[PDB]
CSV table of C-alpha atoms and ligand atoms in Angstrom, one decimal:
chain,number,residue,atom,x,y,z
V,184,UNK,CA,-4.2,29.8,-46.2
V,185,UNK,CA,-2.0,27.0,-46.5
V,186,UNK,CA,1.7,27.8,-47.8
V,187,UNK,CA,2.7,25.8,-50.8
V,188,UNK,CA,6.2,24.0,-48.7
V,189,UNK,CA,2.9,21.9,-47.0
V,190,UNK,CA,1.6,20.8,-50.6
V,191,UNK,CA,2.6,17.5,-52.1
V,192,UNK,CA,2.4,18.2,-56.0
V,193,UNK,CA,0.6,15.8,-58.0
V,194,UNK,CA,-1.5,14.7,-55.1
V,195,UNK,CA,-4.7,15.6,-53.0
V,196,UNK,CA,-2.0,15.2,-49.8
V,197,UNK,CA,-0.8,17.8,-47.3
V,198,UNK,CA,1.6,17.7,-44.6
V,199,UNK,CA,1.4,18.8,-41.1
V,200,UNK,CA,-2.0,21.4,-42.5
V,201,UNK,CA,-4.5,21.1,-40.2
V,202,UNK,CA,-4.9,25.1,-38.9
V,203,UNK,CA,-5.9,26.1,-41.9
V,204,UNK,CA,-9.8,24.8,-42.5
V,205,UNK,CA,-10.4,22.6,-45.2
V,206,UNK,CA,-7.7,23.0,-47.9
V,207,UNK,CA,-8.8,23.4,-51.3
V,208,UNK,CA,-8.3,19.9,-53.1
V,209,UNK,CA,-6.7,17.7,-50.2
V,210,UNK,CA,-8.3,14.2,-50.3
V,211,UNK,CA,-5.8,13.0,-47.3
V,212,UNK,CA,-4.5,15.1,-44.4
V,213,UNK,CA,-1.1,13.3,-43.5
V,214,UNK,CA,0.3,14.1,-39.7
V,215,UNK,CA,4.0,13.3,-38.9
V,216,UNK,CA,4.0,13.5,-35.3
V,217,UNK,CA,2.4,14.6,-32.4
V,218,UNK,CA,3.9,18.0,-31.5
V,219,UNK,CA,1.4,21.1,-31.4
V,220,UNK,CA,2.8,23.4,-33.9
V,221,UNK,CA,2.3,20.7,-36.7
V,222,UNK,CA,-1.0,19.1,-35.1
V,223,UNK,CA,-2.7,23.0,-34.8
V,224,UNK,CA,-6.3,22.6,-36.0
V,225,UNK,CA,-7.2,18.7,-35.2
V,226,UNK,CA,-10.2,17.6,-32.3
V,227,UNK,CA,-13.1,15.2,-32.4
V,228,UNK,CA,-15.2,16.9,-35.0
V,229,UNK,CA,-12.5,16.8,-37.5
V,230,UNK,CA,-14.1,14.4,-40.3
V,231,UNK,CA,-11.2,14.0,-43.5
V,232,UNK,CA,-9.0,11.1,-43.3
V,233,UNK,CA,-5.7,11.5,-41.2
V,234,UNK,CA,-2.4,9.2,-42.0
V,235,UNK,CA,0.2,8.5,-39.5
V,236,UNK,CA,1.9,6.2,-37.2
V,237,UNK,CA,0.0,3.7,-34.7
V,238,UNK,CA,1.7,5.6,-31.6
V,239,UNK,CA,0.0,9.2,-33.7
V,240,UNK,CA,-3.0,7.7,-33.5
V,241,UNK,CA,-3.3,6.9,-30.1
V,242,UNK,CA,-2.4,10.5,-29.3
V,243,UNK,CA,-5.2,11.3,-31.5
V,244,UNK,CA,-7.7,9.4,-30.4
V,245,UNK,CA,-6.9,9.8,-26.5
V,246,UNK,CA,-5.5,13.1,-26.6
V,247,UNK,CA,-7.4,14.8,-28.8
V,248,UNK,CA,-10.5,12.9,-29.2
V,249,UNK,CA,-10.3,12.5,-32.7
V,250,UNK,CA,-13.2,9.8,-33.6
V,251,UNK,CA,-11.6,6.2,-34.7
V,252,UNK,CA,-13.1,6.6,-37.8
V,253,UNK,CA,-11.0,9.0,-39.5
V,254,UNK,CA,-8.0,7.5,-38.0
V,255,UNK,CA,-5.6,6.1,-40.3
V,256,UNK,CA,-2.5,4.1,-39.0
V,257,UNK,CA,0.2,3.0,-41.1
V,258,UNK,CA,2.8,-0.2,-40.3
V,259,UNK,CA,6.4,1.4,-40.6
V,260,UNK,CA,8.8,0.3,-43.1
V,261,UNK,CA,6.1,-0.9,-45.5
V,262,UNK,CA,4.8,-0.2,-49.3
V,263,UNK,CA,1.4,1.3,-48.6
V,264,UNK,CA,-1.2,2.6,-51.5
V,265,UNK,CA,-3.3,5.6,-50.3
V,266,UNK,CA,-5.4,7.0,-52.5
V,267,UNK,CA,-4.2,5.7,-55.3
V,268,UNK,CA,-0.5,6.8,-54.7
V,269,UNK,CA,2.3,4.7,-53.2
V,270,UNK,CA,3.6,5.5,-49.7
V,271,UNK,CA,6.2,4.4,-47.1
V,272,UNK,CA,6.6,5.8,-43.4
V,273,UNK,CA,10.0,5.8,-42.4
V,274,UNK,CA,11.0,6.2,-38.5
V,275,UNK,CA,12.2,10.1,-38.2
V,276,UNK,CA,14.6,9.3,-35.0
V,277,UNK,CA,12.6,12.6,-33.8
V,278,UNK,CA,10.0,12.3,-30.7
V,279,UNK,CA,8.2,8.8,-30.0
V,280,UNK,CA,5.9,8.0,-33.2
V,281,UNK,CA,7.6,10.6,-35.4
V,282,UNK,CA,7.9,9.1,-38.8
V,283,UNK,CA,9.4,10.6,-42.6
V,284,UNK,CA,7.2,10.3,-45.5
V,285,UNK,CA,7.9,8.6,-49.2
V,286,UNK,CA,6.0,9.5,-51.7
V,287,UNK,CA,6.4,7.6,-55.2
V,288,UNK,CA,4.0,10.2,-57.7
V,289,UNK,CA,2.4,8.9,-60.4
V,290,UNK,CA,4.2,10.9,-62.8
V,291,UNK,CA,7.8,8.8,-61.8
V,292,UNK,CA,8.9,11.4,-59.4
V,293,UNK,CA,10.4,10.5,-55.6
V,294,UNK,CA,9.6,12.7,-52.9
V,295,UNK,CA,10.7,12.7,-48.7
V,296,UNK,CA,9.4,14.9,-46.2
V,297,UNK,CA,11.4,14.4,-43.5
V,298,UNK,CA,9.1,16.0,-40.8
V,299,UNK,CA,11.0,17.1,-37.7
V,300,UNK,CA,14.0,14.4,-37.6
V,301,UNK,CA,17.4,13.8,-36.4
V,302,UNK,CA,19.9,12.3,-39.4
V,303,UNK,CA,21.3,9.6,-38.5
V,304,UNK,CA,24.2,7.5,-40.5
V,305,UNK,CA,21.4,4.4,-40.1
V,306,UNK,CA,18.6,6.1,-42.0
V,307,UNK,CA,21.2,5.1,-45.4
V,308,UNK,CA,20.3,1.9,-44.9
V,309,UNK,CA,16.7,2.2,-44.6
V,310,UNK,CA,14.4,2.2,-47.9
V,311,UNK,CA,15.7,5.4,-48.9
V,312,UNK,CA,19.1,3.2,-50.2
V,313,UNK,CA,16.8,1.5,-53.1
V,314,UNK,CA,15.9,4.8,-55.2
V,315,UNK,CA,16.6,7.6,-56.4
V,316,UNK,CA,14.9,11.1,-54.8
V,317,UNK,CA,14.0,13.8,-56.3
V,318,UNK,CA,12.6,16.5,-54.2
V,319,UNK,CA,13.5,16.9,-50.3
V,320,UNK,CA,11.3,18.9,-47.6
V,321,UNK,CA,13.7,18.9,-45.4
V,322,UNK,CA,13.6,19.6,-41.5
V,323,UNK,CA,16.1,23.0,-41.4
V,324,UNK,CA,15.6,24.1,-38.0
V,325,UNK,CA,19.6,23.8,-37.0
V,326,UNK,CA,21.1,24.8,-40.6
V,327,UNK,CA,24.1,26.8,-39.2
V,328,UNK,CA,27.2,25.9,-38.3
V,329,UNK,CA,27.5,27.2,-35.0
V,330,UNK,CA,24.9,24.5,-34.0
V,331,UNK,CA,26.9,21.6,-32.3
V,332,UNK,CA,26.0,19.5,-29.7
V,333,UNK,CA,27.3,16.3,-28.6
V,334,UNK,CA,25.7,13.0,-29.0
V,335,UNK,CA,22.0,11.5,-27.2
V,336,UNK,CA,24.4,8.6,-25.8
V,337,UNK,CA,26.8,11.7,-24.5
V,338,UNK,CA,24.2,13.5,-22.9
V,339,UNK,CA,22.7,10.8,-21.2
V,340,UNK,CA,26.0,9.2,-19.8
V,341,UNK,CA,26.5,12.9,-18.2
V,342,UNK,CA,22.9,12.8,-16.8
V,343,UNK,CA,23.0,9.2,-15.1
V,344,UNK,CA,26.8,10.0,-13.8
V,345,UNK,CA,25.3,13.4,-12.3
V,346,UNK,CA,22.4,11.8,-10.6
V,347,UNK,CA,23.9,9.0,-8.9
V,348,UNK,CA,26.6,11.1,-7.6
V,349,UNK,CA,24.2,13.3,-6.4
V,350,UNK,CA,21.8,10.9,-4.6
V,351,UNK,CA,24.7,8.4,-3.4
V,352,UNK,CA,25.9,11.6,-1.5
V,353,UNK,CA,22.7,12.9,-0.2
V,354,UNK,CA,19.9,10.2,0.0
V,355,UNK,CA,17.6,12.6,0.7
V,356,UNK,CA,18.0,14.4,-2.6
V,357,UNK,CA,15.3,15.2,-4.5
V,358,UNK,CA,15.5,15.3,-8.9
V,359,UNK,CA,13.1,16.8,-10.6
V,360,UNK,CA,13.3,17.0,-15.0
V,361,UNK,CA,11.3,19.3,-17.1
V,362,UNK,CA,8.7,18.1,-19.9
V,363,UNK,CA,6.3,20.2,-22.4
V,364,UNK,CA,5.7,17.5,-24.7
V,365,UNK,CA,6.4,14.2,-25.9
V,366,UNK,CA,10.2,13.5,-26.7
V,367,UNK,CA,13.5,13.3,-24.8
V,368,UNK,CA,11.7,10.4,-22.3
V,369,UNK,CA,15.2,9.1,-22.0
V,370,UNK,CA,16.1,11.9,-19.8
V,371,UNK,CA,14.1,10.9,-16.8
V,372,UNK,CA,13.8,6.9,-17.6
V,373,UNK,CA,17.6,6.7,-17.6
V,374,UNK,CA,17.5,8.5,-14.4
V,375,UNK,CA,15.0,6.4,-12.6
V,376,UNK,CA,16.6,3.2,-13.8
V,377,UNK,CA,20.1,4.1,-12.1
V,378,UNK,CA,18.3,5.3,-8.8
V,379,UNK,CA,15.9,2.2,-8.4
V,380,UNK,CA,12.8,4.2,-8.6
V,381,UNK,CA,9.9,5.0,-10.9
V,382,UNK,CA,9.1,8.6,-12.2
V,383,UNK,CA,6.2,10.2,-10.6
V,384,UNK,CA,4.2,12.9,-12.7
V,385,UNK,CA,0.5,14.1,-13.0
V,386,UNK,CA,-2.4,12.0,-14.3
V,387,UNK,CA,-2.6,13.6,-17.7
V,388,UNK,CA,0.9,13.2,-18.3
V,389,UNK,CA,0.8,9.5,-17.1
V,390,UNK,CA,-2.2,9.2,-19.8
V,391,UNK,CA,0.5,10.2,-22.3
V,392,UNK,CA,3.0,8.3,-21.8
V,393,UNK,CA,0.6,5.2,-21.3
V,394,UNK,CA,0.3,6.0,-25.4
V,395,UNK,CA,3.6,5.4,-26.4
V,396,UNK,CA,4.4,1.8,-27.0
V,397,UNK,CA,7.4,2.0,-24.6
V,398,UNK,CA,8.3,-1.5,-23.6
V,399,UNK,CA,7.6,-2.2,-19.9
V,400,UNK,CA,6.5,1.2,-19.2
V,401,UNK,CA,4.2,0.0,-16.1
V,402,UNK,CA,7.6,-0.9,-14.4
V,403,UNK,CA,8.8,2.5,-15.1
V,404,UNK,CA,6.1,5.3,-14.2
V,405,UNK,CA,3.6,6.2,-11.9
V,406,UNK,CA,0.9,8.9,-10.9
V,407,UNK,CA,2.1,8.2,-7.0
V,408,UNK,CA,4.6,11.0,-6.2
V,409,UNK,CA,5.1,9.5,-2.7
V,410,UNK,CA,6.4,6.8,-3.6
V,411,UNK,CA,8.8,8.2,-6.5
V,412,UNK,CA,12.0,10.2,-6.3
V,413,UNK,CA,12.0,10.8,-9.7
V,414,UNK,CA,9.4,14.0,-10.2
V,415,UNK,CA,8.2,15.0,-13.9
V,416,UNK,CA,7.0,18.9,-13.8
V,417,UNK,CA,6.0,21.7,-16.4
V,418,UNK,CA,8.9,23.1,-18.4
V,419,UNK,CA,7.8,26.5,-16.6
V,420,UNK,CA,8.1,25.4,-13.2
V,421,UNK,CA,11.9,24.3,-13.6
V,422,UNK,CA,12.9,27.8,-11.8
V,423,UNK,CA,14.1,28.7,-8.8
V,424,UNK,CA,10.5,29.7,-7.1
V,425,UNK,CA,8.8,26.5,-8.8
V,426,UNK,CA,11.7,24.6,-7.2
V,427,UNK,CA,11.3,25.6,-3.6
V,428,UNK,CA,7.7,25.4,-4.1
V,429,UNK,CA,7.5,21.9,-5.5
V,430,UNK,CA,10.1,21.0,-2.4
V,431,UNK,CA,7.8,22.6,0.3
V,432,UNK,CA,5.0,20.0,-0.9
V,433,UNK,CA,7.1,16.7,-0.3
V,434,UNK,CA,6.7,17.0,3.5
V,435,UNK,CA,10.2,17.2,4.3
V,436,UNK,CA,10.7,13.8,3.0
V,437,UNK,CA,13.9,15.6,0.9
V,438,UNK,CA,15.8,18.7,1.6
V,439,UNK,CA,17.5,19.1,-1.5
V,440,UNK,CA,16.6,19.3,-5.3
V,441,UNK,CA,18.8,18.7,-8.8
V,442,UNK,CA,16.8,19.2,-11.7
V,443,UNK,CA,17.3,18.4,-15.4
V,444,UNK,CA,16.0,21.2,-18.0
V,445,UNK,CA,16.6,19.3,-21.4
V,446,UNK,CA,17.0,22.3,-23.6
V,447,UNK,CA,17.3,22.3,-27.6
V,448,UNK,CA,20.7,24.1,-28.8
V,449,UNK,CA,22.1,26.9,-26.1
V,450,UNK,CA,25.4,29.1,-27.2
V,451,UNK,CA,27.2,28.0,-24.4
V,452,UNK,CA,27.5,25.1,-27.0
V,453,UNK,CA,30.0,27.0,-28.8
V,454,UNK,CA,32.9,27.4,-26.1
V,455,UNK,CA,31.7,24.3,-23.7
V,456,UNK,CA,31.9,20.2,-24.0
V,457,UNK,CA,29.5,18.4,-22.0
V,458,UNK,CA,32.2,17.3,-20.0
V,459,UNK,CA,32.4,20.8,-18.2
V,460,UNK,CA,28.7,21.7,-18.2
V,461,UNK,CA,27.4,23.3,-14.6
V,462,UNK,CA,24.4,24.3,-13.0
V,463,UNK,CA,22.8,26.9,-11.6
V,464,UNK,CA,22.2,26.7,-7.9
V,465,UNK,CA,20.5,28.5,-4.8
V,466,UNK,CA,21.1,27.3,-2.0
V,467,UNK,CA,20.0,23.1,-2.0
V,468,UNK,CA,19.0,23.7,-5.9
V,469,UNK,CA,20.6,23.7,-8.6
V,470,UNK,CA,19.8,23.4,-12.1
V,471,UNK,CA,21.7,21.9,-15.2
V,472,UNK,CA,20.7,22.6,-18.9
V,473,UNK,CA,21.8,19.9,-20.8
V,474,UNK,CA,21.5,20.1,-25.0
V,475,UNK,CA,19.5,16.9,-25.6
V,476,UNK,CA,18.5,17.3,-29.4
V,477,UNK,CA,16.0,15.7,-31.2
V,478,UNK,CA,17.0,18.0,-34.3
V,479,UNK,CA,19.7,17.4,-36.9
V,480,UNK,CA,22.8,19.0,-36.0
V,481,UNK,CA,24.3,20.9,-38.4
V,482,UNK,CA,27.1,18.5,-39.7
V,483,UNK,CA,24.4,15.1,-39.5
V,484,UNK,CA,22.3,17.2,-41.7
V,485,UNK,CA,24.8,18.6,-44.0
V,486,UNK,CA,25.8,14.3,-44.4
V,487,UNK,CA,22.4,13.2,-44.7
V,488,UNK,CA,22.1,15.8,-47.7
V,489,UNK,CA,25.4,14.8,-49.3
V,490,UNK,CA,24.6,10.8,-49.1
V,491,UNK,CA,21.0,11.7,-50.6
V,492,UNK,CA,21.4,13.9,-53.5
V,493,UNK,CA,18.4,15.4,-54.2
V,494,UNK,CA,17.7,17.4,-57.2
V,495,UNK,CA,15.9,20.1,-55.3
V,496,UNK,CA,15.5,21.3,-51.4
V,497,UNK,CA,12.2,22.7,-49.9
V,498,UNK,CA,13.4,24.0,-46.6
V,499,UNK,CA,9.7,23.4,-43.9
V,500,UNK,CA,11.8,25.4,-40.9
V,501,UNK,CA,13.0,29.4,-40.6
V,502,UNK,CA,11.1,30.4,-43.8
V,503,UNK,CA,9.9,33.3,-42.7
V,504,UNK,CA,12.6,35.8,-43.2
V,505,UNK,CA,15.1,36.9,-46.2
V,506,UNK,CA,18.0,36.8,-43.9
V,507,UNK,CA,17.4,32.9,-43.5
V,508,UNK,CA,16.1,31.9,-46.3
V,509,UNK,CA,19.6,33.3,-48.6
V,510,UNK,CA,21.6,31.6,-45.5
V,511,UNK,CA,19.8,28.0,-46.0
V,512,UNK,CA,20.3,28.7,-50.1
V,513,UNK,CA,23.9,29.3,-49.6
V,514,UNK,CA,25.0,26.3,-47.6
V,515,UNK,CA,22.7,23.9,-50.2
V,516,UNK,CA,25.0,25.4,-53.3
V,517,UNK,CA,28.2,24.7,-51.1
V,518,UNK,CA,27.0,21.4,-50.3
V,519,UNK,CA,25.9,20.7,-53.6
V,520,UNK,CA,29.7,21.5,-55.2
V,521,UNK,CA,31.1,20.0,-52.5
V,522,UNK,CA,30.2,16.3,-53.4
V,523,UNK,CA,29.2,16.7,-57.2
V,524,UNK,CA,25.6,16.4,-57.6
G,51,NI,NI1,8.7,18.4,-33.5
């Protein structure tokens, strides 16, 4: 059964419901981006409408198989009636195609669902500027203070410097960076830019990434590993053991690897800048974990908040214990007297 923080009130709409069978009443399944945990339930013989972004629904229909038909892509940034109801997708700054949603209900209230997003100083100068918002289903998976990490820019600069080093040194280096879904494709593009080569990966992840919209992106990847020094891999296999066996099937073309595991939040956040940050090596690998985020930190949340004002806050993220839920609860009332509202 569907819990009531994926209901829009007033509405036949859901959000991010589709594990669940057909919920009782919804006229209009709505899909903010294309990670697994919010697309659960969806393949080709899904038949109710779906709304989302034009890169969503090229995941959907290439991906998944979802047939065209049930397929509905919205432009961003634009005053859209579905179903009777007034709609606007705004971009989430989250994962490629991840996108916010406006509802205006017919009643006069103002509703955002922010999705999975990172706040950003920019998004008060989007749409959201020109009204006022009532209710707010907001993204809470970092609402603590001891989640810092620096900025994407940060990260990246640290990445690029690391790479170049290491390859200018040792030509023969290998690097290899970590993927289990779509997001954080600056990691290895950035990379691969500063070297002069293209990212190898497997077909199907190729076939992904051929969704995207990226500009240029025929310049950037390839399925031909051989060519590449650059390598894409599985998440899983950025170990030690997946490591020296990945390196084993070059063909002694490299004799060295430094690999990239882009990693959410990590406590050694709290006593380290990115500056510092080291890896993990054995022998001729090593490993870095670097905190590339595509999730609020705690302070962008706490100003995106502050600058909005809601009247009420639906948390969609850590709902399922006490503990969190009174922890959530307690920063919104300090945020809350904090500014006024
Ligand atoms: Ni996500």
């Amino acid at each position: 059964t569907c819990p009531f923080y994926k209901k829009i009130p007033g509405t036949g709409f859901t959000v991010d419901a589709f594990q669940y069978g057909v919920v009782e009443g919804c006229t209009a399944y709505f899909l903010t981006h294309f990670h697994s945990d919010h697309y659960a339930g969806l393949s080709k013989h899904f038949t109710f409408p779906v709304y989302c972004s034009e890169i969503t629904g090229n995941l959907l229909k290439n991906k998944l198989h979802v047939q065209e038909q049930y397929i509905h892509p919205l432009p961003l940034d634009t005053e859209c009636i579905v179903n009777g109801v007034k709609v606007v997708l705004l971009d989430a700054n989250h994962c490629p195609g991840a996108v916010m949603i406006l509802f205006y209900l017919p009643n006069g209230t103002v509703i955002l669902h922010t999705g999975d997003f990172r706040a950003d100083p920019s998004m008060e100068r989007s749409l959201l500027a020109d009204q006022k918002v009532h209710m707010l289903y907001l993204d809470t998976t970092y609402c603590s203070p001891e989640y810092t990490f620096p900025s994407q820019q940060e990260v990246i600069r640290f990445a690029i410097n690391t790479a170049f080093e290491a390859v200018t040194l040792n030509p023969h280096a290998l690097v290899v960076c970590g993927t289990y879904s779509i997001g954080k494709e600056k990691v290895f593009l950035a990379i691969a830019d500063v070297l002069g080569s293209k990212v190898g990966m497997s077909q199907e992840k190729y076939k992904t990434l051929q969704c995207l919209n990226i500009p240029e992106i025929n310049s950037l990847i390839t399925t031909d590993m051989c060519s590449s020094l650059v390598h894409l891999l599985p998440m899983m296999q950025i170990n030690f053991k997946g490591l020296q066996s990945h390196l084993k099937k070059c063909g002694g073309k490299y004799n060295q690897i430094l690999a990239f595991r882009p990693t959410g939040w990590t406590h050694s956040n709290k006593f380290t800048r990115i500056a510092d940050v080291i890896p993990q090596t054995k022998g001729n690998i090593s490993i870095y974990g670097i905190p590339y985020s595509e999730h609020s930190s705690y302070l962008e949340m706490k100003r995106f908040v502050q600058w909005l004002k809601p009247q009420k806050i639906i948390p969609t993220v850590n709902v399922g214990t006490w503990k969190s839920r009174s922890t959530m609860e307690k920063y919104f009332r300090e945020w809350k007297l904090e500014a006024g509202y």
